Amino acid sequence: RIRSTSTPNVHM
Amino acid sequence: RIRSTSTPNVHM
Amino acid sequence: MGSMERASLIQKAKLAEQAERYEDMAAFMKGAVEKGEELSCEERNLLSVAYKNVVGGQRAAWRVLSSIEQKSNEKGPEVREYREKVETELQGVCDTVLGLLDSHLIKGDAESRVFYLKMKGDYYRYLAEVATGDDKKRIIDSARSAYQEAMDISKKEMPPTNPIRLGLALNFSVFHYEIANSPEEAISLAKTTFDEAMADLHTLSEDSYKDSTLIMQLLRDNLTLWT
Amino acid sequence: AMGSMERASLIQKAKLAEQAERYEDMAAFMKGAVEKGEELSCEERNLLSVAYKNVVGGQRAAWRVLSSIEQKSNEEGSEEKGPEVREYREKVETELQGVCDTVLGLLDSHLIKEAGDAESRVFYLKMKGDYYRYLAEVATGDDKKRIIDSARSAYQEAMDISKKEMPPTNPIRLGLALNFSVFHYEIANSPEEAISLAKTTFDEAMADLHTLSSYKDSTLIMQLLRDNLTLWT
């Protein structure tokens, strides 16, 4: 199974 | 400047 | 760290980031937090990026080792021992972040309050991923409680397309799906969030557009994955 | 406390750490295994090399970024900029030197003297040359001269053995010659020697290429010799 994606680790 | 290439870090 | 001036700690965090030295970057930001002044938006980005790089690496390693462990059990004590070592280090970093949040950062404006409560939720969620038994139940409750308080503030005080509000909702939906065994709530939250955000997108400032659209795409992609 | 750990357990954990991309851990496990005082196998030399080169490789990349920022700042010459980057560059530099010293310590205390065969002796002398070279990149002044000499001496001893004992297509011999040529060009300010060594190495290897199974490895290093020669001419 592919895991769900959370908020990416980038500068907002 | 481009640096010279040395031996790669791979399993030989 | 506390013998360095605050401005020097911030400068060194930025240098460490450029050098891809994220453990150092995190330690510099912890030092800056301990000076007792509020963080700016830029500084919250530095704090967030640093600790997420560190814990991100630990999570990836734990997942590899846990997979090997389970496959083996399906050849000796080594995998269990080493998985436990990595697990202990991960828990240590999560505890450090949660400590800073409780001792210094969680108190100001809605944006910062929501950001720090979201962060508390996230790091309890990372602890939940490796927890077992009764400890796991308590940890899950702590994550839920932090996320819910953040959601409550964000609904009262921020527009539906605000990128902090969106990132919080995305992460809370992941909590529901991956941690809390609640796919119905995960899907319902993500769909409601996406629709309400799109309905107000015309009011969003241009400086937030790239960020908010990125998060809305991830809501969409998860919804496709989950349905 | 790795002294009392089973050697086989340390090797197993090094392999796990590799799979988990935990290179500092991997290196520490291999140091523990070396300290058992038994000779290493081929697989174990690969584990040792990959682990420490990942660690020092990250430090080298970071040092280069910081040194560039430092020099750019200093050239601008603003009355108020520069101290923080210098201090942090120094911190990374100290850590890099520490790792290099650890590797050189293992080579001197355990690995070079205890090697049975020519192939492994050449590998370890090459490694000694490489880690002195990494020290040379960050050294200044008279220390730099001494370090450069140490690297040259290790590489030359390795070259001498490899010419007497190993085929020109052997990947250890090839990797040694490649790295010694880089030393000449990048460290010792000797482009003529760099080019001459790389060209001789490539040609002698190509002459025996028809004899190999081996082939993929040797041709990979030969291509890097070719790429450097293009860069240098």
Ligand SMILES: *CC(=O)NCC1CCN(S(=O)(=O)c2ccc(I)cc2)CC1
């Ligand atoms: C103004 C301010 O507080 N900025 C700091 C960022 C706030 C948002 N977080 S986040 O982790 O919630 C996040 C949201 C959206 C995206 I694209 C990335 C991260 C990061 C710090």
Ligand SMILES: *CC(=O)NCC1CCN(S(=O)(=O)c2ccc(I)cc2)CC1
């Ligand atoms: C049998 C044995 O000793 N194997 C260990 C390897 C020998 C070669 N080295 S190396 O650093 O010289 C190297 C050569 C070629 C390539 I492609 C990568 C590395 C690594 C250990």
Ligand SMILES: [Cl-]
């Ligand atoms: Cl362990």
Ligand SMILES: [Cl-]
């Ligand atoms: Cl520093």
Ligand SMILES: [Mg+2]
């Ligand atoms: Mg002060």
Ligand SMILES: [Mg+2]
């Ligand atoms: Mg200042």
Ligand SMILES: [Mg+2]
């Ligand atoms: Mg103050």
Ligand SMILES: [Mg+2]
């Ligand atoms: Mg445990």
Ligand SMILES: [Mg+2]
């Ligand atoms: Mg100026």
Ligand SMILES: [Mg+2]
């Ligand atoms: Mg120095």
